[PDB]
């Protein structure tokens, strides 16, 4: 009955441990680095085909074909170079909240607000696309579907659980359940070995793809966290929250490294992502603009304010050639 | 341009045309978000007027689509923003549960929460004060004062119903934009869908004239 007191004893022990070996003061090291100054970006192309709000973007491995979600229930695979469309997949469940794209560039994984991550097939003979499988089993609502291979998908659901599926068998081969609140964001690793879950318990967790047991549990936020993205090194990650305080956590040190905060902002963070090098952090706010932060000095670098409504999704290419922000104006802009 | 990129552009335009046509066809339908507290009466009106359950019907040349979210367990604020731009919010309320257990106060809290929500400042509210048939006789023994301390009057359905209706319609902080409609569901008719039609055509006319630069 009293073992919760022993649990909180260990909680204070681990907090004392992680703090006692923390002479970080990260800012007090970055002073030697020369500042990035001020970077401005222009809208190189505008992709305009939708008739409602868009909810998700994902760049293919090609760094050319981006897949974009919608609210009408028509995910359209854009061609980022010539503003051309290739497929207009009409999905059944008109409510969408995420999209994925296969590292090979074959399958598109969609699925929104009715507990069905429905994977599609593009590179097929007999012309048109087809619903390959409808992965069902979740009790809440699908938040983020992400592909590992052409066979294994990991899905952050809304019922406090993360499921690793097997497409060939169409069942939850592995389940991860440590969270108390809705698991709102997922992010894979460059080495694809271990992913990070951002939940509604104001706490980010590091999972293991292979084994299944959580290894790190980072707290420090006051409110919900809405987006995670790994540092391309795979030893740190940014976390955007509803407290307007994107913060970079370290996977090795096992605590928060530094904080990003600007006084006049009271909006929520939607999407965070790093540039290929991993110097500047792209962050999508509710001020109808995306802020480019210096991810080593916390000093604001740039403001891409070219939307009439909030930015719901933000994709950086796997070669760092351009960023693509998806607003609620039924347009998505490709900045560079 | 080039040879096959010229054809690529033809394909782009052709599917853009199909997308515009499908969008036009879908937008001519009207969508009604159907709220309701658990066991209020949400299972009655859904059939009487005939995760997420998209249920559509048609009455007098209009394509009505009821979205009932009551059969989903998640944080409301997270998915509620998805339903912005919906025409009407059918807010079914259990009337008989005034004494059952507090349920009235819980429904009142939910109504206050969703009425003044940041997203639904503009949209009208239709609420059906249902299960009047059992409610009318319930106050012969158990007066309304059990649920409401600050009420003083007669225990007659004709007055009790009117007072509860007034009490619920008082909550909306924005009186000048969003209208509140009210009805008491009657078993013997097709008048419930008639009322829904009347309220929906009213809000549509008002919105169309606002879009017409006159209002």
């Amino acid at each position, epitope marked *: 009955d009293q073992l919760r007191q022993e649990a909180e004893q260990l909680k204070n022990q681990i907090r004392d441990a992680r703090k006692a070996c923390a002479d970080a003061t990260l800012s007090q090291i970055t002073n030697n680095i020369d500042p990035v100054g001020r970077i401005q970006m222009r809208t190189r192309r505008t992709l305009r085909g939708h008739l409602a709000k868009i909810y998700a973007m994902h760049w293919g491995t*090609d760094s*050319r*074909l981006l897949v974009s979600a919608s609210q009408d229930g028509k995910l359209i695979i854009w*061609d980022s170079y010539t503003t*051309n469309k*290739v*497929h207009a997949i009409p999905l059944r469940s008109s409510w969408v909240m995420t999209c994925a794209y296969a590292p090979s560039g074959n399958y598109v994984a969609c699925g929104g607000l009715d507990n069905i991550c429905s994977i599609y097939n593009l590179k097929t*003979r*007999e*012309g*048109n696309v087809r619903v390959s499988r409808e992965l069902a089993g979740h009790t809440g609502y699908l938040s983020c579907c992400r592909f590992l291979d052409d066979n294994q998908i990991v899905t952050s659901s809304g019922d406090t659980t993360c499921a690793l599926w097997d497409i060939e068998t169409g069942q939850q081969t592995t389940t991860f359940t440590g969270h108390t609140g809705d698991v709102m964001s997922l992010s894979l690793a460059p080495d694809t070995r271990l992913f990070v879950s951002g939940a509604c318990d104001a706490s980010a967790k590091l999972w293991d793809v292979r084994e299944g047991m959580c290894r790190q549990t980072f707290t420090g936020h006051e409110s919900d966290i809405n987006a995670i993205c790994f540092f391309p090194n795979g030893n740190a990650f940014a976390t955007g929250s509803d407290d307007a305080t994107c913060r970079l956590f370290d996977l090795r040190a096992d605590q928060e490294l530094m904080t990003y905060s600007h006084d006049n902002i009271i909006c929520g963070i939607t999407s965070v992502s790093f540039s290929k090098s991993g110097r500047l952090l792209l962050a999508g706010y509710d001020d109808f603009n995306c802020n480019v932060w210096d991810a080593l000095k916390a000093d604001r670098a740039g403001v891409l304010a070219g939307h009439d409504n909030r930015v719901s999704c933000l994709g950086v290419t796997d070669d760092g050639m351009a960023v693509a922000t998806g607003s609620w104006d039924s347009f998505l802009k490709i900045w560079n | 341009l*080039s*040879a*096959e*990129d010229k*054809a*690529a552009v*033809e*394909r782009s335009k*052709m599917i853009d045309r199909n997308l515009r046509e499908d969008g036009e066809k879908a937008a001519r339908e009207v969508k009604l978000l159907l709220l309701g507290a658990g066991e209020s009466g949400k299972s009655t009106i859904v059939k009487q007027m005939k995760g997420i359950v998209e249920t559509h019907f048609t009455f007098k040349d209009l394509h009505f689509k009821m979205f009932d979210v009551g059969g989903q367990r998640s944080e409301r604020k997270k998915w509620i923003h998805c339903f912005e731009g919906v025409t009407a919010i059918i807010f079914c309320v259990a009337l008989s549960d005034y004494d059952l257990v507090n349920r009235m106060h819980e429904s009142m809290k939910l109504f206050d929460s969703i009425c003044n929500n940041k997203w639904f400042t503009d949209t009208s509210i239709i609420l059906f004060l249902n299960k009047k048939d059992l409610f009318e006789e319930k106050i012969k023994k158990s007066p309304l004062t059990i649920c409401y301390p600050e009420y003083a009057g007669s225990n007659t359905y004709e007055e009790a119903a009117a007072y509860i209706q007034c009490q619920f319609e008082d909550l909306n902080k924005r009186k000048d934009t969003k209208e509140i409609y009210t009805h008491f569901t009657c078993a013997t008719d097709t008048k419930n869908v008639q009322f829904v039609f009347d309220a929906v055509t009213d809000v549509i006319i008002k919105n169309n004239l606002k879009d017409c630069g006159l209002f």
Partner: single-chain antibody
Amino acid sequence: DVQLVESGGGLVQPGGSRKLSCSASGFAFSSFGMHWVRQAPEKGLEWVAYISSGSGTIYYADTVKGRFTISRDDPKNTLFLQMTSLRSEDTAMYYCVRSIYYYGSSPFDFWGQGTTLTVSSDIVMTQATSSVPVTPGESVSISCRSSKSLLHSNGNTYLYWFLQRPGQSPQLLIYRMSNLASGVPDRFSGSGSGTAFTLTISRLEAEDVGVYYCMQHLEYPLTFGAGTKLEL
């Protein structure tokens, strides 16, 4: 799978009239550009007609312009080629050919069996080699020299390599000189630059004997080479 079959062949009197029906079954026909290509009894291929997806654009060859008419029916899934006033140079086999033009697509994939119809400035893809015998087990290169630099500003080199087998419909082998045609063994390798192309068939075995046609796709009309037949 995809089932292209054509009908309305036979023999016609010179100056006559005939229609050729290419019936497509087992794919979304309403989204596919359709080519009509013919073959003389003992000569190389030649381009005849093209129709785009949804009757949006049409193209004809210089030889048959104004005489032939091409039409498509989407709800019945049929392609009609009506010819009138037949000349002695039209006695040929006629194939209706699938094509779909989007980014990273494979046009000219599936070729129908085709029908026999008999009677009583542009690029010249001058395929240099005509005949060469081979032994099984060796690797051999076949080259065809273009008359114009095909490399566009986009960075792509619009050349296709088609293989035809003895008494068969010619199937797509390589598309855009680099990427392998789907359902083809990894033996074939296309290479080259502007105005220089070569298909290297590594460790050549049986079930590869036949004729090889290199075909440009830069402007219209599209032209096939003389071809090279690899003798057993």
